[PDB]
Design an enzyme around this catalytic site. Structure first.
Site, PDB file in Angstrom:
ATOM      1  CE1 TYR A   5      50.291  45.716  33.498  1.00  5.03           C
ATOM      2  CE2 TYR A   5      48.423  46.498  34.772  1.00  5.03           C
ATOM      3  CZ  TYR A   5      49.535  46.756  34.000  1.00  5.03           C
ATOM      4  OH  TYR A   5      49.895  48.055  33.728  1.00  5.03           O
ATOM      5  CG  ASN A  27      39.207  41.727  52.271  1.00  2.75           C
ATOM      6  OD1 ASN A  27      40.421  41.613  52.108  1.00  2.75           O
ATOM      7  ND2 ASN A  27      38.667  42.770  52.891  1.00  2.75           N
ATOM      8  N   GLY A  28      41.202  39.324  50.426  1.00  2.00           N
ATOM      9  CA  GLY A  28      42.280  39.519  49.469  1.00  2.00           C
ATOM     10  C   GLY A  28      43.285  40.604  49.834  1.00  2.00           C
ATOM     11  CG  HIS A  73      51.443  42.791  48.185  1.00  2.00           C
ATOM     12  ND1 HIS A  73      50.449  42.226  47.417  1.00  2.00           N
ATOM     13  CD2 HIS A  73      51.390  44.125  47.946  1.00  2.00           C
ATOM     14  CE1 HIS A  73      49.820  43.174  46.744  1.00  2.00           C
ATOM     15  NE2 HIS A  73      50.371  44.334  47.048  1.00  2.00           N
ATOM     16  CB  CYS A 132      47.339  45.119  48.564  1.00  2.00           C
ATOM     17  SG  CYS A 132      46.594  43.539  48.154  1.00  2.00           S
ATOM     18  CG  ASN A 159      50.576  48.251  47.060  1.00  7.60           C
ATOM     19  OD1 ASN A 159      50.340  47.122  46.636  1.00  7.60           O
ATOM     20  ND2 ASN A 159      49.662  49.214  47.085  1.00  7.60           N
TER      21      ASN A 159
END
Length: 355
Positions: free
Chosen positions: A268, A282-283, A287, A299, A301
């Site tokens: 995407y 590191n990202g 969220h 992450c 979620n």
């Protein structure tokens, strides 16, 4: 009649001596007279600016009371009266050292900033440092209440060297923190010198801890009011190392309300990424769920509604305690990884001894 040696003549002692060079601008600067007293004394730089100074009671000593500048010639003017009643001039000069380079530094926090209970104090320098021990000895931290902590030198960044201060345990909520770095006139090594003194005052806000057991499918937010948020959530699918939410105590740094991302490895090119709280360089974010295992890597979620609620509560410095993960948070993840190492390791990273 008479026949007696005259009284002693006044003797001037310049510290530093006349025409001395490479004077450290923070060194003691003074002129002393023996067998007489100072009528007037003054020190000026080459541009004619008078430097603050003061006499001792006896007016036999004049001492400078403010720091000098680098690479500057200073000159004494004045006069001293002897037993004669005769005045002798007070004159002479010296020149302060001109560093090979001045090393600059800054904090990552602003004065008056309120942060979470795991916020480090990050001093970033714009150059490598040889005598990190000497620099560290110039750092002092004061907390109210007093709290055990230590300075640790991390690997140099591209920009230059860096030292973090961390408490051993989480700050008590409300703690005030004063940091002082007496770097002006300090030799860093190899003829380097500190650009200036630095101070930072900040404080710790409310206690908030995120409990994130990876195998729990939940995340909890705990404050003095108890569990204030208990959300269903998904963690990284953990099929690849990039998809494993790292284990250990994370620190919240930045957050973004709207900021929809381009993920190459997923496919995407316009993933809607909202209410994102950064918990690692590191990202890793906590969220909103954008909806593939790559679309959201390590992450955490949440539903968009839950994500916003957590987002609005989060503060820089907040600890996020990830447990149940295979890969421990590391230097390899970038900042902040300070709380992912044991205390004895942290102490070992100091340029000074234990104590």
């Amino acid at each position: 009649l008479a026949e007696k040696r005259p009284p002693p003549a006044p003797r001037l002692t310049f510290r530093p001596a006349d025409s001395a060079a490479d004077v450290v601008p923070i060194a003691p600067i003074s002129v002393e007279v023996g067998d007489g007293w100072f009528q007037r004394v003054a020190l000026t730089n080459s541009a004619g600016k008078v430097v603050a100074g003061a006499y001792s009671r006896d007016r036999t000593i004049y001492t400078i009371t403010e720091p000098l500048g680098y690479d500057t010639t200073y000159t004494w003017s004045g006069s001293a009266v002897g037993h004669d009643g005769k005045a002798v001039p007070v004159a002479g000069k010296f020149t302060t050292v001109a560093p090979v380079k001045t090393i600059n530094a800054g904090f990552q926090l602003a004065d008056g900033q309120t942060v979470g209970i795991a916020a480090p104090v990050i001093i970033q320098f714009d150059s490598p440092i040889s005598d990190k021990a000497a620099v560290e000895r110039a750092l002092t931290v004061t907390t109210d209440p007093p709290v055990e902590g230590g300075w640790a030198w991390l690997p140099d960044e591209a920009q230059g060297a860096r030292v973090h201060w961390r408490p051993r345990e989480y700050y008590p909520a409300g703690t005030t923190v004063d940091v002082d770095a007496k770097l002006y006139g300090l030799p860093f090594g190899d003829g380097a010198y500190g650009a200036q003194d630095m101070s930072l005052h900040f404080q710790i806000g409310r206690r908030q801890v995120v409990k994130a057991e990876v195998s729990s499918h939940r995340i909890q937010v705990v404050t003095d009011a108890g569990v204030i948020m208990d959300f269903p959530c998904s963690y990284g699918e953990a099929d690849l190392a990039r998809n494993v939410t790292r284990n250990g105590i994370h620190v919240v740094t930045e957050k973004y309300s709207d900021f929809y991302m381009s993920n190459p490895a997923a496919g995407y090119s316009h993933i809607h990424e909202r209410w994102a709280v950064r918990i690692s360089n590191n990202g890793e974010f906590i969220h909103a769920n954008p909806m593939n295992s790559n679309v959201t890597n390590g992450c955490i979620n949440l539903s968009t509604e839950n994500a916003e609620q957590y987002y609005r509560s989060a503060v820089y410095g907040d600890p996020v305690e990830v447990t149940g993960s295979s890969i421990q948070l590391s230097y390899a993840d970038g900042d902040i990884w300070d709380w992912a190492v044991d205390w004895d390791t942290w102490v070992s990273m100091s340029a000074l001894p234990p104590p």
